[PDB]
Design a binder for this molecule. Sequence first.
Ligand code: HEC
Length: 90
Amino acid sequence: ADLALGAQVFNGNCAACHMGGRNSVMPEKTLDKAALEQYLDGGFKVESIIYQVENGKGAMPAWADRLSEEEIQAVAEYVFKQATDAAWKY
Ligand code: HEC
């Protein structure tokens, strides 16, 4: 999908906690492929990330009220793309 929009959305909303694909609230739950396979409900799939973005999880807020449907799909695919290619620079 729109990967340029995904970065804009990730950069303006998610980076407060996932700077560099890291996790400042919970160090272990990072945005790396292996963290995702291990800690994200549903595993490493775009769908699992979308679900977690819209409904939140614990200290992670829900985004359904703040982002649009297309923004959620974009950010999810962007995060997916980053983990696959292991492109997170921290
Ligand atoms: C800080 C207050 C956060 C913001 C802003 C966003 N996320 Fe987050 N995320 C945060 C926590 C503490 C956690 C784990 C919560 C738990 O109880 O398990 C997460 C987790 C994720 C994950 C899964 C990570 C993993 O299991 O290894 C994803 C895929 C995720 N977060 C994505 C993400 C995106 C795209 C955001 C912007 C829309 C976003 N998070 C904001 C804390 C915070």
